């Protein structure tokens, strides 16, 4: 009877931050914990920040592993909370890693290997971006480019189709309040219906 | 008439740090530079430090690339010094990477690919560990386990037999002062007999 590991994925500006906000308001905080990635506060965070804000560059090789290492700092914490019965709501995760790394020409099976071992999600909510959402990308940050996002999406779809992971795909076409309600409902369900040990991702 | 790139390898507790100390004392310092790996001071260093001292874990596959990236920070520096006529004395290198990564079940040819491109050594001094040396491993750090080191050695031996690299294998059975003398002698020779461009490793 652990907490549930719930992960939000999607393109930039798909509004997964908003939806995370809903869940946090819809559920009592003594039982739930919000986790954003990347965690820009850490050592690997500040560096990631410099790269996304265009005030430093790195090897494609260096950024791929900064993001990964950025997650591993927290793999202990994640595990501990779930066991302590706290449910985790996580903005971006392993998949943000692989899809974005792979979109940049990296090997999808290799990107996966690096994540291989992390706490495995019980539910992954993917937010579709329609017209007025993809074209929300105005390059204030590094990956925020319409043509590139279309490329990430190719990699996301690929991983979904591989489903050993429980995915819930939310259409772009729902109405704000209705999307909010729908998600809120699958979330609380994920939480009452959870059992067993925390899974290990891609192992 | 560059400097020579000289690399020390061997199991843990094979005393390659001692022997590096000899070379540094036996040769004038305006001409020679000592380089330890891993370079635990850097960003990838501190992380490597956390992993070896058991205060963080990571994907096997991630640690593999922490170590690699840890070497690349310095590939520029190495190159520059050799060209500037300084000889490099390096504790652990590319091979520490491959042998340890491969011992942990990774692909030997893949581990190599990641190192592929680094400055190529003119001399690689491998220190054999006998009885009282292997059994010096008491697990104060993560790879310091007798049964695992026996596995790394298998991977070292393999790479030696591939010799496109100039290796000098120093027996365990020599006497301290005599080992010191012998190494001191091959080193200064490596240094007077060096010519041409710095090689690129495994390319
Ligand atoms: O692992 C990653 N995680 C990640 O979020 N990104 C990217 C995803 C997004 O473009 C950017 C900023 O995210 P937010 O501010 O919208 O949360 O970080 C990239 C990688 C790997 C790149 Br190689
Ligand atoms: O830190 C690095 N610096 C570097 O120049 N390189 C370089 C190493 C190699 O020459 C080059 C080839 O890149 P691709 O063929 O994948 O495009 O990557 C690699 C690393 C890897 C750290 Br892990
Ligand atoms: O690339 C590597 N380089 C390396 O030095 N090591 C290892 C070799 C040794 O077990 C450990 C402790 O460092 P020392 O202070 O004794 O030099 O670092 C491991 C890898 C890859 C492992 Br996967
Ligand atoms: Mg953004
Ligand atoms: Mg966000
Ligand atoms: Mg050691
Ligand atoms: Mg050392």
Swiss-Prot record, chains A, B:
One of its GO terms (molecular function) is dTMP kinase activity. Pathway: Pyrimidine metabolism; dTTP biosynthesis. The keyword ATP-binding applies. InterPro entries: P-loop_NTPase, Thymidylate_kin-like_dom, Thymidylate_kin_CS, Thymidylate_kinase. It catalyses: dTMP + ATP = dTDP + ADP. Its EC number is 2.7.4.9. Induction: Expressed in the early phase of the viral replicative cycle. Keywords: ATP-binding, Early protein, Kinase, Nucleotide biosynthesis, Nucleotide-binding, Transferase. It is an enzyme of class 2 (transferase). One of its GO terms (biological process) is dUDP biosynthetic process. Homodimer; the dimer arrangement is orthogonal and not antiparallel as in human enzyme. Belongs to the thymidylate kinase family. Poxvirus TMP kinase is able to phosphorylate dTMP, dUMP and also dGMP from any purine and pyrimidine nucleoside triphosphate. The large substrate specificity is explained by the presence of a canal connecting the edge of the dimer interface to the TMP base binding pocket, canal not found in the human homolog. This is Thymidylate kinase. It comes from Vaccinia virus (strain Copenhagen) (VACV).
């Amino acid at each position: 009877s652990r907490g549930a590991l719930i992960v939000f994925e999607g393109l930039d500006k798909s509004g997964k931050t908003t939806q995370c906000m809903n869940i946090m308001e819809s559920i009592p905080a003594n039982t739930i914990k919000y986790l954003n990635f990347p965690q820009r506060s850490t050592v690997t965070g500040k560096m990631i920040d410099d790269y996304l804000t265009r005030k430093k560059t790195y090897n494609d090789h260096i950024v791929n592993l900064l993001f990964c290492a950025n997650r591993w700092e927290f793999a202990s914490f994640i595990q501990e909370q779930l066991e302590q019965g706290i449910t985790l709501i996580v903005d971006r995760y392993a998949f943000s890693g692989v899809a974005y790394a792979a979109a940049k020409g990296a090997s999808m099976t290799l990107s996966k290997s690096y994540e291989s071992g992390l706490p495995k999600p019980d539910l992954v909510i993917f937010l579709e971006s329609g017209s007025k959402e993809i074209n929300r990308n105005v390059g204030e940050e590094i990956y925020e480019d319409v043509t590139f996002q279309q490329k990430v999406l190719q990699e996301y779809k690929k991983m979904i189709e591989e489903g050993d992971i429980h995915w819930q795909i939310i259409s772009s076409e729902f109405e704000e309040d209705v999307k909010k309600e729908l998600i809120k409902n699958i979330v609380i369900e994920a939480i009452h219906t959870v059992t067993g040990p925390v899974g290990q991702l891609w192992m």
